[model samples]
Target chain A: VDNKFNKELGWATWEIFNLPNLNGVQVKAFIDSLRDDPSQSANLLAEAKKLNDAQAPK
Target chain B: VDNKFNKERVIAIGEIMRLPNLNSLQVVAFINSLRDDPSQSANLLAEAKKLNDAQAPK
Candidate 1:
């Protein structure tokens, strides 16, 4: 009988988020988050508005 | 209150399985599974035993 492969590996759900502009800060934060939790992959496009607001010319 | 960014990103749970040896068939199957479902990332090491069993030379 085929072994139940699912039990051998531990899989978990991940939280996803968006970041705007893909700037240094946003990218850094995304990468840092990934490093902190390898399972999660952030969606930078969703945060575009935040990026624009934060990085808009002062 | 800060706008909730969580909704913008779609998060989901995935199943994980092990693959013993990293062979052509095993890698192909693993990658195929990932392509079929981006959320799932199979564990090659855990699946090593299956890989060995399948690929063992006659």
Candidate 2:
């Protein structure tokens, strides 16, 4: 699991949990799925940015 | 842009665009923003997970 997608998954995981540590079995599984599907990564990242922009000060 | 948020942003951008390389201008600006506000990092990441679970196959 720590091959090509290691850094990518780590980033996405942080993008999910808001911290540097990775915990929870289910979340780990979810991260695996994300590695399997690039589209999921794209969607999640896009969604995250949307939420970020919405809350950003203007 | 070689910090923690840089890795996160790189993943997100790659996910969105399906590419490996990134625009230097955006990279520099984003790293600046991330360094400026870590609170935003927590919010953006936590929010990202909500959307990820929402879109995941159940």
Candidate 3:
């Protein structure tokens, strides 16, 4: 991640993601998987967002 | 990005591009390809980031 990548990710998680919505180990595994096979981004991002939406404030 | 995609990312990237200094029409044209996307302006951003990252470290 670049400066804005880190900052943006941080900010978005704080404001939108609500870190409790995610797991550290899980994110590491996700990013690692993406690094190896970027094509998986389509699915990983979908899954990640699906998980993110699941925890949205209701 | 699945169902969870939304404005937090657009907010962050806009910050990075100093887009707050830009006009609504400007942002719309640039981000939404000068089209009217009635939905929240977030999906384009995840795609933008993916595009940016893939083009990076070249």
**Pick by DockQ: which candidate is best?**
1
Window of ten residues with lowest summed lDDT in model 2 chain B: B16-25
Model 2, clash count? 0
TM-score ranking, best first: 3, 2, 1
lDDT winner, 1 or 2: 2
Which tens-of-lDDT digit does each residue in B1-58 have in candidate 2?
4455565554443232222232222222232344454435434333334344444458
Residue by residue across A6-51, what tens digits does model 3's lDDT show? 3343233222223346555444433333333344533444555666
Off by over 4 Å in 2: A16-39, B1-58
lDDT of model 3 at position A13: 28
Over the true interface, candidate 1 deviates by an RMSD, in Å, of 10.3
Q: What is the DockQ of each candidate?
A: 0.14, 0.07, 0.03
Summarize candidate 3's per-residue lDDT along B22-45 as a digit string, tens digits. Answer: 333332333443123314444444
- CA RMSD per model (angstroms): 12.1, 14.3, 12.8
Off by over 4 Å in 3: A1-20, B1-58
Q: What is candidate 2's local distance difference test score?
A: 0.40
Comparison by DockQ, 2 against 3, better one: 2
Which candidate's TM-score is highest? 3
Chain B: TM-scores of all predictions: 0.36, 0.33, 0.40
Q: What CAPRI grade goes to candidate 2?
A: incorrect
Task: Please provide the root mean square deviation of candidate 3 (C-alpha atoms, Å).
Answer: 12.8
What are the clash counts of all predictions, listed in order?
11, 0, 0
